[PDB]
UniProtKB/Swiss-Prot annotation, chain A:
GO terms for molecular function: RNA binding; structural constituent of ribosome. The gene is MRPL32. Component of the mitochondrial large ribosomal subunit (mt-LSU). Mature mammalian 55S mitochondrial ribosomes consist of a small (28S) and a large (39S) subunit. The 28S small subunit contains a 12S ribosomal RNA (12S mt-rRNA) and 30 different proteins. The 39S large subunit contains a 16S rRNA (16S mt-rRNA), a copy of mitochondrial valine transfer RNA (mt-tRNA(Val)), which plays an integral structural role, and 52 different proteins. bL32m has a zinc binding site. One of its GO terms (cellular component) is mitochondrial inner membrane. It comes from Homo sapiens (Human). Keywords: Mitochondrion, Ribonucleoprotein, Ribosomal protein, Transit peptide. This is Large ribosomal subunit protein bL32m. It is found in: Mitochondrion. Its main location: mitochondrion.
From Swiss-Prot, chain B:
It is found in: Mitochondrion. It comes from the Eukaryota. Component of the mitochondrial large ribosomal subunit (mt-LSU). Mature mammalian 55S mitochondrial ribosomes consist of a small (28S) and a large (39S) subunit. The 28S small subunit contains a 12S ribosomal RNA (12S mt-rRNA) and 30 different proteins. The 39S large subunit contains a 16S rRNA (16S mt-rRNA), a copy of mitochondrial valine transfer RNA (mt-tRNA(Val)), which plays an integral structural role, and 52 different proteins. It comes from Homo sapiens (Human). The chain holds residues 122 to 294 of 306 of the full protein. GO terms for cellular component: mitochondrial inner membrane; mitochondrial large ribosomal subunit; mitochondrion. Its main location: mitochondrion. Belongs to the mitochondrion-specific ribosomal protein mL45 family. GO terms for biological process: mitochondrial translation. Component of the mitochondrial large ribosomal subunit (mt-LSU). Within the mitochondrial ribosomes, required to direct the nascent polypeptide toward the tunnel exit and position the exit at a distance from the membrane surface. The keyword Glycoprotein does not apply. This is Large ribosomal subunit protein mL45. The gene is MRPL45. Keywords: Mitochondrion, Ribonucleoprotein, Ribosomal protein, Transit peptide. GO terms for molecular function: RNA binding; structural constituent of ribosome.
From Swiss-Prot, chain D:
One of its GO terms (cellular component) is mitochondrial large ribosomal subunit. Keywords: Mitochondrion, Ribonucleoprotein, Ribosomal protein, Transit peptide. InterPro entries: Ribosomal_bL17, Ribosomal_bL17_sf. Detected in adrenal gland, mammary gland and adipose tissue. This is Large ribosomal subunit protein bL17m. It comes from the Eukaryota.
From Swiss-Prot, chain E:
The modification N6-acetyllysine is found at residue 91. It is linked to Combined oxidative phosphorylation deficiency 59: An autosomal recessive mitochondrial disease presenting with multisystem manifestations of variable severity. The disease spectrum ranges from lethal infantile Leigh syndrome to a milder disorder characterized by hypertrophic cardiomyopathy, lactic acidosis, attention deficit-hyperactivity disorder, and survival into adulthood. Keywords: Acetylation, Leigh syndrome, Mitochondrion, Primary mitochondrial disease, Ribonucleoprotein, Ribosomal protein. It is found in: Mitochondrion. Changing residue 264 to V: In COXPD59; uncertain significance. Residues 28-94 form the TGS domain. This is Large ribosomal subunit protein mL39. The chain holds residues 36 to 322 of 338 of the full protein. One of its GO terms (cellular component) is mitochondrial ribosome. One of its GO terms (biological process) is mitochondrial translation. The gene is MRPL39. Isoform 1 is ubiquitously expressed. Isoform 2 is heart-specific. Its main location: mitochondrion. Component of the mitochondrial large ribosomal subunit (mt-LSU). Mature mammalian 55S mitochondrial ribosomes consist of a small (28S) and a large (39S) subunit. The 28S small subunit contains a 12S ribosomal RNA (12S mt-rRNA) and 30 different proteins. The 39S large subunit contains a 16S rRNA (16S mt-rRNA), a copy of mitochondrial valine transfer RNA (mt-tRNA(Val)), which plays an integral structural role, and 52 different proteins.
Length: 108, 173, 166, 152, 287
């Protein structure tokens, strides 16, 4: 089934400039209090999450280094310690992960 | 100055401040009318970009009023023959003058200075000429800024000096 | 090709008289040869047409389209050069006056069909054009009130003449 | 019509769906925090809690062991489930996992989600937090609460 | 006549502002370092007395302009439209902060002053209305209040529900006006000149000057209305969203004169409450 006639620019404009076709303005956008970058509500802030993910990756690299090879998951809990930190009574009997940097403010 | 005179055969130090003043004023005047052809004759190739590059896409209303103190030569130096067939002579002149300056935008909105009110200014201006080269003339080469110089008049615009833009992994100090 | 949009920032107006309202700063900026349809680009251009700079950047940041990040880049460049070169007071104090997509130079390729027959495929390119104007974004035109309609109708009635007479 | 259909159709079919979820779950047990498409994460979440329940049921239990053997492809994780994860949650009766929406994926613009097991060693997520009690609206309501309790 | 009094007050205010503006040593520059969690270590090189914290926000983003209610300058509260004086550290305080106590107080005071303006203009010409003060009542109390002395004619008069609605509508009109909260920092003598007619204002200015080491007092204007304030105010009138004048109470020790306490409750656009929650807040504010 082929078009019987060429559709005009007038009719085409009516189709493609319809509100239905148009991009809708978003009202979800707020400033993240932590970093000041824009976040959509209901969604984790991209900047803050990227920061957390970078740190998580570093810790995981260290975890892999200590484990050595595959199929070496520990049968005890894990704890991450930074520079100038010692294991506590709770941290005793846990796997210790050492980081070469200082504690982040957000990490508690 | 003996090294300059031997090439020139006819040079007067006593007359030079008057010439220097004329060159200076004419160069600064042609900035207003944006005649680069005349500027090239009056201004050294080193000096040209220094006084031209920022002036692009904006209007200057520089003017000269009476000088408080007559200009005088302070230092005379010459080249040490770095290039064959090239000798350069430099004269430094002290100028204590009153001047008016108004700088505007593309859009004609005033950026800097006030049109009517004159301001006192003390400047060291060094002039360079290429000797051993015919058709050569004394041209404004550089302005020396003293370390003890008073700060320039403040701009009308308020500016923001941005802090260090940091990647997520980076931590502020 | 033509590149008139670039030359628009090269206009110098004469200095304003003291007894004159302050002229709003205008900034012209475009990206040429974006690998993207002009038709697709149009929607994003239309979206940010009346908006302030910050509003526009926000909307573009959370848009899923490819062209959104390209417009964001162009807007940021324009905001930067506005403050630096065009003597805009505040980076926030800008709004989009013009936001347009245009066709770019394109390439013809062959698209093989399921016989000896074929089709001609066209690699689309577009330009994005933006004009920023210093100042708060102008208020949107208010919807016509009943009183406005009424007034217009009375005006129509009062305007009418005895036609085809002395 | 799909009234009261509780499971999504994903992968190459029913078996493939199980296998996809199994891989996500294995990832979660190992890493304790997993990024994946939102729908897949939401589907896997239920299985995550159920696995902890079987972990609690006991190491010695053969039924729980069989389930754990199936759902964990990497076998080293099976001790971890029984000896680390299950003892951790012994206090609480549920809500072992935490799921949060993440900015859309770069390539395919997919809705994304992070899932973690609670009480992990990893750096804390930028969780959404309710407004402080010291805000104006909260102050007014605290006043109201005080007045009501004084009335009684 | 009230019209001539407000006219005269405006003239004096404008004269004082012009005087303060004239003594500026030709657009001097001050360095203002931004100390915040967001966008750290940014410096503003700005005018000595022309520039305001709002123009600092204008340098940053629209978001700062929209959300920032007060500026903390050297750890001291500061109006958004209050001109800066010296090189200082600035941060911006919003309603959403961990301790928005200062913002709460500022909003409370601002609403009190708005109500004052409304009730001044509300009454008929024949009747006499005299504004006493805005007491520093906590937000936890549930209602911002203002003390007013009325004429002897309306001693037996008690406002109706419709009257309270009318005050509310006038307040909403004032919100719709979108008037900035203009501020002025003056010597006591100037304030005495402005507020010579109202004895209550005289007394309040006297005590405010007394508590200060100098005789420095603060004045605020919305639109043709001038009032002496306890502290800093919110930037703009448009900040208020939900604004109702709750009730009027006669103060018990009415031996010398009868003082009406006007009570109302408000919430900003940022912290909009639902219809139901709002109704609860109203029923409390009437007490
Ligand atoms: Mg073939
Ligand atoms: Mg369904
Ligand atoms: Mg599928
Ligand atoms: Zn953030």
């Amino acid at each position: 089934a082929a078009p019987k006639n060429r559709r005009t620019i007038e009719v085409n404009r009516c189709r493609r400039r319809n509100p239905q076709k148009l991009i809708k303005v978003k009202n979800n956008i707020d400033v993240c209090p932590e970093c000041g970058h824009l976040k959509q509500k209901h969604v984790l802030c991209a900047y803050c999450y990227e920061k957390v993910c970078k740190e998580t990756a570093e810790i995981r690299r260290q975890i892999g280094k200590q484990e050595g090879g595959p199929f070496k998951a520990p049968t005890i809990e894990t704890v991450v310690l930074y520079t100038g930190e010692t294991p506590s009574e709770q941290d005793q009997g846990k796997r210790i992960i050492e980081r070469d940097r200082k504690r982040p403010s957000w990490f508690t | 100055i003996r090294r300059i005179k031997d090439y020139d055969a006819n040079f007067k130090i006593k007359d030079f401040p008057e010439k220097a003043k004329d060159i200076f004023i004419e160069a600064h005047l042609c900035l207003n009318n944006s005649d680069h052809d005349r500027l090239h004759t009056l201004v050294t190739e080193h000096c040209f970009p220094d006084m031209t590059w920022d002036i692009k896409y904006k209007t200057v209303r520089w003017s000269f009023v009476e000088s408080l103190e007559p200009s005088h030569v302070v230092q005379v130096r010459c080249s040490s023959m770095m290039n064959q067939g090239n000798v350069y002579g430099q004269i430094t002149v002290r100028m204590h003058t009153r001047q008016t300056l108004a700088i505007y935008d593309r859009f004609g909105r005033l950026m800097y200075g006030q049109e009517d009110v004159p301001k006192d200014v003390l400047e060291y201006v060094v002039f360079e000429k290429q000797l051993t080269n015919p058709y050569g003339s004394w041209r404004m080469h550089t302005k020396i800024v003293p370390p003890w110089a008073p700060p320039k008049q403040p701009i009308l615009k308020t500016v923001m000096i941005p802090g260090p833009q940091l990647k997520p992994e980076e931590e502020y100090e | 090709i033509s590149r008139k949009w670039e030359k628009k920032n090269k206009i110098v107006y004469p200095p304003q008289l003291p007894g004159e309202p302050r002229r709003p700063a205008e900034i012209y900026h475009c990206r040429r040869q974006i690998k993207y349809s002009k038709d697709k680009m149009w929607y994003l251009a239309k979206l940010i047409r009346g908006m302030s700079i910050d509003q526009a950047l926000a909307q573009l940041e959370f848009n899923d389209k490819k062209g959104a990040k390209i417009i964001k880049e162009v807007l940021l460049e324009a905001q930067d050069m506005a403050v630096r070169d065009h003597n805009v007071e505040f980076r926030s104090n800008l709004y989009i006056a013009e936001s347009t997509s245009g066709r770019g130079q394109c390439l013809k390729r062959i698209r093989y069909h399921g016989r000896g027959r074929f089709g001609i495929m066209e690699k689309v390119y577009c330009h994005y054009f933006v004009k920023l104007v210093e100042g708060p974004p102008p208020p949107p035109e208010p919807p016509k009130t009943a009183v406005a309609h009424a007034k217009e109708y009375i005006q129509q009635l009062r305007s009418r003449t005895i036609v085809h007479t002395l | 019509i799909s009234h009261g259909r509780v499971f999504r159709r994903m992968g190459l079919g029913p078996e493939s769906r199980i296998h996809l979820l199994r891989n996500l779950l294995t990832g979660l047990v190992r890493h304790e925090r997993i990024e994946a498409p939102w729908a897949r994460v939401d589907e896997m979440r239920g299985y995550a809690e159920k696995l902890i329940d079987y972990g609690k049921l006991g190491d010695t239990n053969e039924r729980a062991m069989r389930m754990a053997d199936f759902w964990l492809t990497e076998k080293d994780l099976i001790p971890k489930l029984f000896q680390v994860l299950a003892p951790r949650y012994k206090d609480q009766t549920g809500g072992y996992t935490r799921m949060l929406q993440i900015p859309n994926r770069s390539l395919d613009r997919a809705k994304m989600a992070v899932i973690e097991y609670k009480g992990n060693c990893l750096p804390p997520l930028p969780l959404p937090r309710r407004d402080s009690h010291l805000t104006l609206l909260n102050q007014l309501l605290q006043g109201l609460r005080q007045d009501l309790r004084q009335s009684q | 006549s009230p019209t001539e009094l407000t006219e005269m007050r405006n003239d004096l205010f404008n004269k004082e502002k012009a005087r303060q503006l004239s003594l500026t040593p030709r657009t001097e520059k001050i360095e203002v370092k931004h100390v915040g969690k967001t966008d750290p270590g940014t410096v503003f090189v700005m005018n000595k007395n022309i520039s305001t914290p709002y123009s600092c926000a204008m340098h940053l983003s629209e978001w700062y302009c929209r959300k920032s209610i007060l500026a903390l300058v050297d750890g001291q509260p500061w109006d958004m439209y209050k001109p800066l004086t010296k090189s200082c550290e600035i941060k911006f305080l919003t309603f959403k902060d961990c301790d928005p106590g200062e913002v709460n107080k500022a909003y409370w005071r601002s609403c009190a002053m708005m109500m004052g303006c409304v009730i001044e203009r509300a009454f008929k010409d024949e009747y006499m209305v005299n504004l006493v003060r805005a007491p520093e009542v906590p937000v936890i109390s549930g209602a911002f209040c203002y003390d007013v002395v009325l004429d002897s004619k309306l001693d037996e008069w008690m406002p109706t529900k419709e009257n309270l609605r009318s005050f509310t509508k006038d307040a909403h009109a004032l919100i719709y006006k979108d008037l900035p909260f203009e501020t002025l920092e003056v010597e006591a003598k100037v304030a005495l000149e402005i507020f010579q007619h109202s004895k209550y204002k005289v007394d309040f200015i006297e005590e405010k000057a007394s508590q200060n080491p100098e005789r420095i007092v603060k004045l605020h204007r919305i639109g043709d209305f001038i009032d002496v304030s306890e502290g800093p105010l919110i930037p703009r009138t448009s900040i208020c969203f939900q604004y109702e004048v709750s009730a009027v109470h006669n103060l018990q020790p009415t031996q010398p004169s009868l003082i009406r306490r006007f009570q109302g409750v408000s919430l900003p656009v940022h912290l909009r409450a639902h219809f139901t929650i709002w109704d609860k807040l109203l029923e409390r504010s009437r007490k």
